[PDB]
Design a protein around this ligand. Sequence first.
Ligand code: CA
Ligand code: CA
Ligand code: CA
Ligand code: CA
Ligand code: CA
Ligand code: CA
Length: 453
Amino acid sequence: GTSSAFTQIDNFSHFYDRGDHLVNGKPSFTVDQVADQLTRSGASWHDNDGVINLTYTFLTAPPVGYASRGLGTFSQFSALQKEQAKLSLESWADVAKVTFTEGPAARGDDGHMTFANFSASNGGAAFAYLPNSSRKGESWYLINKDYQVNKTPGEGNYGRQTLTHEIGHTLGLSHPGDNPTYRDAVYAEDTRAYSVMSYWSEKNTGQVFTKTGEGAYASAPLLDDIAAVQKLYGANLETRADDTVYGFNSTADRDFYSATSSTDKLIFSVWDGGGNDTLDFSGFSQNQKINLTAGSFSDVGGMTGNVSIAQGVTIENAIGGSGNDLLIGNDAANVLKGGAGNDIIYGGGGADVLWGGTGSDTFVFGAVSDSTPKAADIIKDFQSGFDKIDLTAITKLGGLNFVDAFTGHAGDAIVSYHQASNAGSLQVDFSGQGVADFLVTTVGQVATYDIVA
Ligand SMILES: [Ca+2]
Ligand SMILES: [Ca+2]
Ligand SMILES: [Ca+2]
Ligand SMILES: [Ca+2]
Ligand SMILES: [Ca+2]
Ligand SMILES: [Ca+2]
């Protein structure tokens, strides 16, 4: 078998797997299947220029026929609502080839949107219309003494998500399914851990974002939402195409991607167009499980399944926090830093740069191809006696035979050290061809007792 360290890596790596199985008695849908699901109405703005350019207006007066909508008193968006609406619009624009410019309907635009408030509860908390309807572009928001949610929308609260969700609807995204409860969902992932369009909380799928008495809602399009809107209008590859840091020390310039304190409740799906990027969750003291696999979920900031990387996005680096984290790389050359605490770092393919940080860290390898002589991982701060290099997924605990030179037998391993440069290495001949087919180099000596095989 394998060590518990690898099992933990393997477990988390698969913990959020989707497709071809039942969850909560419902079929689990992959991202692509949800994208089909969320665009099942067939409605969309139409372009040609390859981009959908929409204009939008913050209504200053009721439109003709307004009074017949049974909405009561009309009111214009306050400056705060406009501000939040613009951030919400932007977060959609960041991921799909759609643009939102404030202004009156124009001949050259591809459609027009309107935002306004109403005061009669009978109208519902808020609502919008698909782009193929006669009220295409419109989204309305309730505000009265009894319902104050839309009055102060802000990063992380339902007021901001409402804006995001309603705009999503005007873009062509329908709700995940047709009193109803999650039990009536058509697919397992119909919760707001996967999509802001869902009416059901993340607790239905097991994720934990916050506790009772507190609200925590993704401010921007989540994983399936991104997939859905990109299916409709194409992926916007131009956003954040240079190097980008997400989380703490964020350079993404988006409130929902920024963290400044250990108590921040991050709920986002990373959309990124290119460059060498990092998920920096170093400011957190809670245990995290960061997965750089495209389309995968991570447990960040003491929460679970709250962070994800969109399909088609390559994120290269991850920085754990103070807790006992799991860091999982992808096929690219990754820089993974555990931070303080006892971490389990898995590089995956390519030559990775691993940092344990203080504590007692474990560097896991699941396949020979993870770290070869021609493309080897480098653990830049290996602390012998405390850190470990785990090869159990490869050896299945069969053990290794530490020697000074490969004898041609499968399982031979060579622990070397070059004092003059404080550089160490673990070479292994798994195939037994008489030469190393697996290599890991370190900064700091490595001893046979630091290896788990
Ligand atoms: Ca980037
Ligand atoms: Ca990248
Ligand atoms: Ca850590
Ligand atoms: Ca550490
Ligand atoms: Ca990698
Ligand atoms: Ca690797």
